[PDB]
């Protein structure tokens, strides 16, 4: 009979928003994000059914833009390496895989440094780097370390994030048990290829998710339950050298002997995880098989991961066939698949040995089954833990009908 408006109506609607950083107490180099750790307010909702779709999520793109902006902002004060296109002189090294590095000498208006074979173009003697002209090389400042530091994500006023506590829940479909929280948990993202490394785990049995599961171009990610102990070793010593062009922080030579970086992984844990995922890969009927990547260039057919500021490229083709794994180390890299920009990434002195685990896997369906790994997209890696988070906008200006005299 009459129109009445009610304030504080608990209703929401999907809309875009701008979040902000959050982290625990301290003292990926931070120094820009706020390290606020308030009291975690966890409120559980009942009789609420809200659909979730992490494939069309917007906070993933927001965090993508934020991390790339922070990376470009931190990389800006570092010195450049653009006038280093002077002709090198690479002879040879200084008991297998001893031809992967050759120390070369540069003019720089004479000093020499140790370089890898794959880090220089085979200009057929005289040699040159992978990209000197038309692609600038920007080194990283050694004053800060880009180690994975746990952070949190919180929404401002008028926005909230819905958390799903249901373990047996994929990316799509409705969510029965949903909870509203102001900030996320202590997520520790890490860049990797064909693996997830550090990250949140999942309970119950194995779980799989995808966008369509029919198209072969779409990637399929599997979240593991039992963590696989993966640590690896780097059996090398190396040295430190500074050449004035501008300090040019790099390795000078080798003390002792040259031995390629390589390690072993647990066999029982790998076999158990492989059988556990194979138990469900036959679902959703045809036989299944494991085959390596199709091919292409580097960092897409082999496992790629970082270990305390040092990139490691390990050959994991034998793991997805039929445990030692040969690994190759390189300093030059092209982060974010950028063209025209490069990262020098100097090494560190002494041997390095980090400790990590396994919380996920990357699978790509083959057309024409033979589930091969690959993809090379970090979006799925970051979305492996953001599946239980979805921002939303609240509009408490509800209207209800009643007879007001």
């Amino acid at each position: 009979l009459w129109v009445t408006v009610y304030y504080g109506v608990p209703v929401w609607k999907e809309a875009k928003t701008t979040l902000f950083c959050a982290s625990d107490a301290k003292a990926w180099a931070t120094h820009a994000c706020v390290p606020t750790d308030p009291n975690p307010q966890e409120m559980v909702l009942e009789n609420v059914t809200e659909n979730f779709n992490m494939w069309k999520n917007d906070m993933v793109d927001q965090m993508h833009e934020d991390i790339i902006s922070l990376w470009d902002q931190s990389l800006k004060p570092c010195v450049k390496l653009t006038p280093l296109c002077v002709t090198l002189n690479c002879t040879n090294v200084n008991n297998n895989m001893k031809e992967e590095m050759k120390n070369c000498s540069f003019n720089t208006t004479k000093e020499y440094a140790l370089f890898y074979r794959l880090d220089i173009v085979p200009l057929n003697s005289e040699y040159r780097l992978i990209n000197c002209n038309t692609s600038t090389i920007t080194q990283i400042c050694p004053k800060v370390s880009f180690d994975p530091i746990p952070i949190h994500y919180c929404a401002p006023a008028g926005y909230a994030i819905l958390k799903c506590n249901n373990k047996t829940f994929n990316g799509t479909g409705p969510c029965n048990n949903v909870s509203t929280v102001q900030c996320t948990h202590g997520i520790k993202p890490v860049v990797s290829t064909q693996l997830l490394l550090n990250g949140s785990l999942a309970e119950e049995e194995i779980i799989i998710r995808s966008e369509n599961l029919t198209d072969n171009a779409k990637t399929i990610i599997v979240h593991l339950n039992e963590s696989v102990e993966i640590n690896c070793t780097r059996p090398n010593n190396m040295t430190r050298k500074s050449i004035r062009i501008q300090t040019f922080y790099a390795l000078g030579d080798i003390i002792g002997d040259i031995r390629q970086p390589h390690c072993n992984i647990s066999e029982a844990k790998w076999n158990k995880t492989l059988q556990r995922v194979k138990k469900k890969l036959k679902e959703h009927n045809k036989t299944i098989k494991f085959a390596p990547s199709s091919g292409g260039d580097l960092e897409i057919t082999t496992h790629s991961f970082n270990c305390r500021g040092e990139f490691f490229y390990c050959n994991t083709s034998k793991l997805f066939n039929s445990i030692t794994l040969p690994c190759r180390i390189k300093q030059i890299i092209n982060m974010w698949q950028e063209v025209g920009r490069a990262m020098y990434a100097p090494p560190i002195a002494g041997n390095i040995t980090c400790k990590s685990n396994i919380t996920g896997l990357l699978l790509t369906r083959d057309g024409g089954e033979t589930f091969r790994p690959g993809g090379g997209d970090m979006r799925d890696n970051w979305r492996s833990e953001l599946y239980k988070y979805k921002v939303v906008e609240i509009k408490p200006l509800g209207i209800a009908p009643t007879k007001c005299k």
Epitope: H64, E65, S69, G296, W336, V339, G340, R341
Partner: antibody, heavy 126, light 107 residues
Framework: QVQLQESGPGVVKPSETLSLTCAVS??????????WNWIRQPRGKGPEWIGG????????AYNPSLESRVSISRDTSNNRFSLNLRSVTATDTATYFC?????????????????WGQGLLVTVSS | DIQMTQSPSSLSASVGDTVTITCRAS??????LAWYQQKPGKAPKVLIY???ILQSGVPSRFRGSGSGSDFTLTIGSLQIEDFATYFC?????????FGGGTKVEIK
Amino acid sequence: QVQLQESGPGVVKPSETLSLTCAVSGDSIKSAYQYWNWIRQPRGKGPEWIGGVYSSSDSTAYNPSLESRVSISRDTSNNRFSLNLRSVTATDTATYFCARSVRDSRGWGRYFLDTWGQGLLVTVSS
Amino acid sequence: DIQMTQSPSSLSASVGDTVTITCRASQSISTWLAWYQQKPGKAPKVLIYSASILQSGVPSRFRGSGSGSDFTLTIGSLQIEDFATYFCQQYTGSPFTFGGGTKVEIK
């Protein structure tokens, strides 16, 4: 389905600062991994590359023979990206295109064009 | 600089025949090559990328193969809508040089 639209002057005299813009409909400038490439197709031979701009890092790259004359600029609002060219002379002529490239899943760093525009004939005369 | 060349300039065939286009590169670039179809007027469209993966929406009468520096693309059936100019473009870093350009003729 993403569509590309470009607009600009028809007759442009040489020895000035040329400016062209391209409107993007449907897809956003941010996206995931895309490059807003700017290319030309001179009549007589194949096309040529001028430069491209990243979607998020707003980084850039130019041709090895067109330095200090091309400055690609983009903005978040209006869903469009522009192009600035200096010293047009009698070389920078014919139609211009504002295509988009998507990354390849077979390799790392590969980028190929898949969606193009319509073409804007840039005539140079006295 | 990474130079790109295309040979021959043009050929002559009939409808339903096989057309072979070869592109030679300056150095080995593995399989980092793409093909483009440019019809008379408007803007061209991509044909085959990565030298072996087809495009979603192109007919099955086009097949490409090759590795290293020598590449050759064949056409199973030449239709009325396939009469256009073929261009091969490499994308092994900047710059993104195009091919010389080929054309077909009908007697």
